[PDB]
DNA sequence: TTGCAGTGCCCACAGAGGCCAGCAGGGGGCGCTAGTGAGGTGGTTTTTATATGTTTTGTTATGTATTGTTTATTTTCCCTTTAATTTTAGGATATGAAAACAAGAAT
């Protein structure tokens, strides 16, 4: 529930950034799954990415499936819904990306693992 | 004149072939109808589309609460100066205790 944790009043953004760093050092797959799930539920898609469906089958059919499994109740998406709670949601989202990527610049960002999948999925979407 | 060898004629029943009704062969043209097949029109609904009313969303303005700012009255740390207050002899007191005297008592 990293989408909800980042959204619903995160006390310290660097704290959950370090939590994601610790989970990635523990196991790359689960932290990558959590980051992808965070991005998908940040896109307004209420579908949840699973371990095998992230690991095995590719990103374009993931995009097609989440287009089929968007599960909307309205046409609005979290980038345009009214204001306050969602405005601070968007700010926390941007700051989480910035702090998470910038904090790993010393040793983690040269493992050549997360950026391939992240770039592929984000480019496809 | 006759017997014999050969001819004439008349009939008749077969023999034959045209005449004729009967009958079957292939094909042309009409009287009439059941049964679909398709095409056109009308009705129905229906579905898209359009417009109106209500409500939801976004924007604006006012009031309250929070943070900051130079005063500003504590307040408090640090002097130099007294006002109790304490300590050390120095003399006087007192209350005791021997010491001498005087008074019973004994020898």
Curated annotation (Swiss-Prot):
Protein name: Cohesin subunit SA-1
Post-translational modification: Phosphorylated by PLK1. The large dissociation of cohesin from chromosome arms during prophase is partly due to its phosphorylation.
Function: Component of cohesin complex, a complex required for the cohesion of sister chromatids after DNA replication. The cohesin complex apparently forms a large proteinaceous ring within which sister chromatids can be trapped. At anaphase, the complex is cleaved and dissociates from chromatin, allowing sister chromatids to segregate. The cohesin complex may also play a role in spindle pole assembly during mitosis.
Family according to the record: Belongs to the SCC3 family.
Whole-protein residues included: 86 to 210 of 1258
Taxonomic superkingdom: Eukaryota
Subunit structure: Cohesin complexes are composed of a heterodimer between a SMC1 protein (SMC1A or SMC1B) and SMC3, which are attached via their hinge domain, and RAD21 which link them at their heads, and one STAG protein (STAG1, STAG2 or STAG3). In cohesin complexes, STAG1 is mutually exclusive with STAG2 and STAG3. Interacts directly with RAD21 in cohesin complex. The cohesin complex interacts with the cohesin loading complex subunits NIPBL/Scc2 (via HEAT repeats) and MAU2/Scc4. NIPBL directly contacts all members of the complex, RAD21, SMC1A/B, SMC3 and STAG1.
Native source organism of the sequence: Homo sapiens (Human)
Disease field: Intellectual developmental disorder, autosomal dominant 47: A disorder characterized by significantly below average general intellectual functioning associated with impairments in adaptive behavior and manifested during the developmental period. MRD47 patients manifest developmental delay and mild to moderate intellectual disability, usually with delayed speech.
Location of the protein in the cell: Nucleus; Chromosome; Chromosome, Centromere
């Amino acid at each position: 529930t990293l989408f909800e944790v980042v959204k619903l009043g995160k006390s310290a953004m660097q704290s959950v950034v370090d939590d994601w760093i610790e989970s990635y050092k523990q196991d790359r797959d689960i932290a990558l799954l959590d980051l992808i799930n965070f991005f998908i539920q940040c896109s307004g898609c209420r579908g949840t990415v699973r371990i095998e469906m992230f690991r095995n089958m590719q990103n374009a059919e993931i995009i097609r499936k989440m287009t089929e499994e968007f599960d909307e109740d309205s046409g609005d998406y979290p980038l345009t819904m009214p204001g306050p709670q969602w405005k601070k949601f968007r700010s926390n989202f941007c700051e989480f990306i910035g702090v998470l990527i910038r904090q790993c610049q010393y040793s983690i960002i040269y493992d050549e693992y997360m950026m391939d999948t992240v770039i592929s999925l984000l480019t496809g979407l």
